[PDB]
Amino acid sequence: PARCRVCGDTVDEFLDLGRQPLSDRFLTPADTDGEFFYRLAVGRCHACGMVQLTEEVPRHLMFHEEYPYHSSGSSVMREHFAKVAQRLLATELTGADPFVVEIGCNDGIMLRAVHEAGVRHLGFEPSAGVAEVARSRGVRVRTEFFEKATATAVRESEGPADVIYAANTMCHIPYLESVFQGADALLGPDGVVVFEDPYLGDIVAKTSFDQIYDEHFYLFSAGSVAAMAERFGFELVDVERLPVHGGEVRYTLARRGARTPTEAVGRLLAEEREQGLDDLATLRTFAANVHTVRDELVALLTRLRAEGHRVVGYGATAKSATVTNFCGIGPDLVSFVCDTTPGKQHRLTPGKHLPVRPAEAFADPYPDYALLFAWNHADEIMAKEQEFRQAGGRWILYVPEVRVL
Amino acid sequence: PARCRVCGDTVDEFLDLGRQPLSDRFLTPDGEFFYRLAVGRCHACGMVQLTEEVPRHLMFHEEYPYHSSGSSVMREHFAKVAQRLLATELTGADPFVVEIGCNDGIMLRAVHEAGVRHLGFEPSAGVAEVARSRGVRVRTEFFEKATATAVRESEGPADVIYAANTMCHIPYLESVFQGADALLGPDGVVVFEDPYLGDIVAKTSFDQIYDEHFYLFSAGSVAAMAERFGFELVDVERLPVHGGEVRYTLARRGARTPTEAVGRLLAEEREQGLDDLATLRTFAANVHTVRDELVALLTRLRAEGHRVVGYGATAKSATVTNFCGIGPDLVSFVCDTTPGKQHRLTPGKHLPVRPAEAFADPYPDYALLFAWNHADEIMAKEQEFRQAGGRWILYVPEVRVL
Numbered sequence: 001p002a003r004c005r006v007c008g009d010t011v012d013e014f015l016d017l018g019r020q021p022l023s024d025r026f027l028t029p030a031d032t033d034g035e036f037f038y039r040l041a042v043g044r045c046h047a048c049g050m051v052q053l054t055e056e057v058p059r060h061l062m063f064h065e066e067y068p069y070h071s072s073g074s075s076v077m078r079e080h081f082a083k084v085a086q087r088l089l090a091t092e093l094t095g096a097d098p099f100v101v102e103i104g105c106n107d108g109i110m111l112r113a114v115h116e117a118g119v120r121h122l123g124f125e126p127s128a129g130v131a132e133v134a135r136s137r138g139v140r141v142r143t144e145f146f147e148k149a150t151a152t153a154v155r156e157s158e159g160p161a162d163v164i165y166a167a168n169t170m171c172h173i174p175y176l177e178s179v180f181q182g183a184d185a186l187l188g189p190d191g192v193v194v195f196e197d198p199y200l201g202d203i204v205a206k207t208s209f210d211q212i213y214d215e216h217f218y219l220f221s222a223g224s225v226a227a228m229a230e231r232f233g234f235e236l237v238d239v240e241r242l243p244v245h246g247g248e249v250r251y252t253l254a255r256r257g258a259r260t261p262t263e264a265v266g267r268l269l270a271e272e273r274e275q276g277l278d279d280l281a282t283l284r285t286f287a288a289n290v291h292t293v294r295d296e297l298v299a300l301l302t303r304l305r306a307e308g309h310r311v312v313g314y315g316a317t318a319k320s321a322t323v324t325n326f327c328g329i330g331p332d333l334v335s336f337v338c339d340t341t342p343g344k345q346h347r348l349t350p351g352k353h354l355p356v357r358p359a360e361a362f363a364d365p366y367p368d369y370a371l372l373f374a375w376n377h378a379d380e381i382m383a384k385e386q387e388f389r390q391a392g393g394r395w396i397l398y399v400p401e402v403r404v405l
Numbered sequence: 406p407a408r409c410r411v412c413g414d415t416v417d418e419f420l421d422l423g424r425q426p427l428s429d430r431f432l433t434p435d436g437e438f439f440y441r442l443a444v445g446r447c448h449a450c451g452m453v454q455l456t457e458e459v460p461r462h463l464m465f466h467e468e469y470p471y472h473s474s475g476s477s478v479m480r481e482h483f484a485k486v487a488q489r490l491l492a493t494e495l496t497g498a499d500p501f502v503v504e505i506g507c508n509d510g511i512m513l514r515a516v517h518e519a520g521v522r523h524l525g526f527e528p529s530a531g532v533a534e535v536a537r538s539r540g541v542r543v544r545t546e547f548f549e550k551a552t553a554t555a556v557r558e559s560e561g562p563a564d565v566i567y568a569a570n571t572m573c574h575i576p577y578l579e580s581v582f583q584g585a586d587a588l589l590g591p592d593g594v595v596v597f598e599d600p601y602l603g604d605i606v607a608k609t610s611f612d613q614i615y616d617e618h619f620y621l622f623s624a625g626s627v628a629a630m631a632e633r634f635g636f637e638l639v640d641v642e643r644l645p646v647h648g649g650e651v652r653y654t655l656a657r658r659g660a661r662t663p664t665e666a667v668g669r670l671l672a673e674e675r676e677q678g679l680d681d682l683a684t685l686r687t688f689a690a691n692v693h694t695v696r697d698e699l700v701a702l703l704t705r706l707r708a709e710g711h712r713v714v715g716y717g718a719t720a721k722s723a724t725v726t727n728f729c730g731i732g733p734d735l736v737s738f739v740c741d742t743t744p745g746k747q748h749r750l751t752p753g754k755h756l757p758v759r760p761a762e763a764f765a766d767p768y769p770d771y772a773l774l775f776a777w778n779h780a781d782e783i784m785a786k787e788q789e790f791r792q793a794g795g796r797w798i799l800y801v802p803e804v805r806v807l
């Protein structure tokens with residue numbers, strides 16, 4: 001059976017999402033025959049507790065020059081990261097020439113604020129097209145993967161870092177031991193690694209299975225991160241819940257013994273215990289709920305198609321690949337998906353090949369129903385689409401359950 | 406005989422913050438108003454409330470120096486509120502939102518831009534003209550039974566009545582909720598967000614207690630006030646703004662099913678013991694502790710010869726300075742970005758208010774952070790101060806130097 005990527009012990013599988021494409025490999029017609037697939041399934045290490053995918057997707061297939069996710073296409077997320085820059089600038093710098101490092105800086109949504117404040121900084125972004133965005137904003141960015149050797153080389157040329165930050169990146173990286181070897185080389189004396197990622201507790205509580213796909217190798221919790229930190233000579237010393245991306249936790253890891261864990265760490269552990277997050281049974285109940293959501297969503301879409309309604313998807317999310325492929329949802333059930341990201345438009349969604357169109361197509365004419373794939377952005381979207389609702393249009397949500405609004 | 410402004414039963418006092426000035430009344434350099442600031446808990450309905458009501462025309466007036474749109478974080482916060490209300494509550498052919506206390510109208514402007522019918526109530530003439538300037542329909546009236554009833558009659562039913570940092574400012578809740586009964590749709594709701602009692606107690610954030618904050622709402626006291634007025638607490642949400650708030654959703658009794666969040670927050674109040682006067686006494690004890698340590702610290706520092714400056718001329722700061730006895734001998738002046746407040750003096754204790762630039766002229770040894778709710782923003786801005794060896798004094802949730 002599978003072996004844990006953190007500790008090497010045995011992983012018990014609890015959800016099999018079947019054959020899946022790369023979530024962010026939007027296709028032209030020419031690409032469909034060559035299309036990569038893998039088996040997506042999730043399990044729990046019985047030793048260390050880390051919840052993780054069973055099949056590692058090679059990193060160069062996911063992250064590469066044409067990687068299509070631009071972080072700065074959301075107002076809520078631009079403002080989130082401006083506040084992140086402030087937090088780090090306020091609490092994690094010392095001395096005359098402090099140094100902020102980000103792993104997975106993308107289009108520079110966070111570091112651009114660090115730069116504008118005059119603080120020395122460096123991002124690692126192996127996806128060149130978004131890295132060019134970051135650079136166009138004044139950000140220093142190496143087009144390379146953060147791992148032990150690259151971090152260690154930066155330590156020599158740039159000196160110690162006050163903080164290494166990563167958002168929606170650390171869970172994308174199976175090779176955590178290399179990353180933390182790199183952090184141990186690169187951080188200064190009072191340095192920390194601060195990372196925020198989709199939280200297992202929220203996923204389980206919301207039945208948000210679409211948070212499970214190729215780029216989410218780990219579904220972190222405080223318990224698993226605490227064990228992982230200790231294994232690599234680090235220590236979980238602070239936790240913070242965040243509402244973005246469906247529910248996340250931001251973890252702060254110091255070298256072991258360097259800092260006093262905050263009371264927040266124990267509080268979140270107790271939440272996990274109240275949730276039963278570390279019982280496989282809870283995880284099995286999750287998997288049954290995932291199956292109910294699939295049946296109810298497919299039955300709803302099938303009925304709306306039978307009635308001759310028009311259904312269109314809203315937001316070509318990476319997440320949505322898990323939904324379409326696990327649920328068997330093709331162009332017969334959802335005619336196209338509207339998305340604001342220019343590089344996603346005029347292409348086909350992974351595996352199930354829904355056409356992606358610009359947002360403007362949503363109004364020409366308005367559909368009867370919009371399937372909200374970008375449900376983590378619901379208020380922004382439902383707010384602005386007033387003409388849709390005035391014409392009687394309805395929203396279909398499937399988190400935390402299938403429902404029509 | 407302290408009487409509950411919601412149910413009229415007896416209020417038991419648990420904290421006395423002494424003689425205080427009006428919080429937002431900054432002085433040019435004799436006729437200075439003081440009132441007694443103290444807080445108690447109605448033993449019958451649980452509502453925590455000030456023991457003396459400041460007459461409202463003294464507080465809310467033409468030159469009121471808070472514009473909501475002044476802060477980036479509240480601009481951002483209110484954009485999201487607009488999106489929330491528009492997404493969740495303002496459904497139908499021709500939905501109508503009313504706001505109590507719309508101020509300079511940032512929130513309603515997004516409702517106006519979405520093409521939704523609305524009306525702000527804003528009795529401060531000046532902020533009201535700003536809101537109008539942004540396209541917001543505003544009456545320059547206090548929201549109360551009569552004014553709300555007439556809006557019902559010209560404009561028809563409202564889907565939502567919303568209030569931010571305003572409901573806690575209004576003693577006359579019965580009048581407000583009558584207004585809302587006249588004016589709300591069938592499935593309409595009153596949605597309001599205010600500084601949360603549970604956070605105040607948890608953070609010993611006693612500077613949240615001052616003239617404008619007449620009520621310190623909890624889920625429990627809100628549920629009881631709602632039921633008194635024939636409404637029902639059907640939703641709650643915690644918000645990090647202004648030191649910790651909760652947003653309460655009220656519908657008419659039986660109109661909606663309370664969300665699971667209402668019960669969870671009531672549980673957290675059970676766990677915190679928030680409905681026990683003993684817990685409030687403990688809080689009052691901690692406030693006294695905070696004063697001792699802060700005073701003792703500032704005194705040590707100025708004997709040691711160090712220079713101290715305040716950062717942010719907040720409304721809240723007046724409670725701290727006057728309760729703690731903090732005058733210009735302990736803390737030399739206060740920097741602030743509100744032109745409105747600059748080159749005037751602080752209420753009661755009289756620290757002078759000078760613009761942000763004065764902080765760097767030269768930097769002090771210690772900066773006493775009154776605008777503690779904006780710590781990241783402020784501390785991230787002030788890189789040279791830190792680089793120069795500066796230090797920050799905070800007193801929430803406890804006195805300490807970072």
Ligand SMILES: Cc1cn([C@H]2C[C@H](O)[C@@H](COP(=O)(O)OP(=O)(O)O[C@@H]3C[C@](C)(N)C(=O)[C@@H](C)O3)O2)c(=O)[nH]c1=O
Binds near residue numbers: 216316320339377
């Ligand atoms: C607000 C808005 C968005 N949209 C569109 C824009 C995006 O294409 C998509 C949203 O993608 P959004 O939920 O942010 O991330 P995705 O699930 O892809 O997830 C990606 C991939 C990644 C790194 N692995 C990850 O973990 C999260 C961080 O990011 O929706 C509109 O059309 N109209 C809109 O008004």
Ligand SMILES: Cc1cn([C@H]2C[C@H](O)[C@@H](COP(=O)(O)OP(=O)(O)O[C@@H]3C[C@](C)(N)C(=O)[C@@H](C)O3)O2)c(=O)[nH]c1=O
Binds near residue numbers: 617647721
């Ligand atoms: C960010 C920043 C602020 N500053 C300054 C700006 C303000 O004067 C003060 C902040 O006041 P701020 O915490 O918002 O509210 P106050 O307690 O006044 O409270 C007021 C009174 C009122 C309506 N009753 C209320 O409840 C809240 C909503 O608003 O500090 C800087 O100098 N530099 C900065 O970088």
Ligand SMILES: Nc1ncnc2c1ncn2[C@@H]1O[C@H](CSCC[C@H](N)C(=O)O)[C@@H](O)[C@H]1O
Binds near residue numbers: 064
């Ligand atoms: N080993 C590694 N080092 C640095 N970046 C990496 C990486 N592996 C993947 N990435 C980058 O991680 C990013 C995840 S996208 C998330 C971007 C941004 N921090 C946000 O929160 O929105 C991608 O741009 C991808 O190229």
Ligand SMILES: Nc1ncnc2c1ncn2[C@@H]1O[C@H](CSCC[C@H](N)C(=O)O)[C@@H](O)[C@H]1O
Binds near residue numbers: 508529568570
């Ligand atoms: N009965 C009443 N009706 C409407 N507005 C009122 C009121 N009593 C006070 N106000 C106004 O309520 C506001 C409180 S200040 C808060 C303003 C804004 N809602 C915000 O959250 O930033 C002031 O503008 C004050 O003039």
Ligand SMILES: [Cl-]
Binds near residue numbers: 017
């Ligand atoms: Cl399964």
Ligand SMILES: [Mg+2]
Binds near residue numbers: 257258259260
């Ligand atoms: Mg230790």
Ligand SMILES: [Mg+2]
Binds near residue numbers: 384385
């Ligand atoms: Mg539009």
Ligand SMILES: [Zn+2]
Binds near residue numbers: 008045047048
């Ligand atoms: Zn393991």
Ligand SMILES: [Zn+2]
Binds near residue numbers: 410412414447450451
């Ligand atoms: Zn009472």
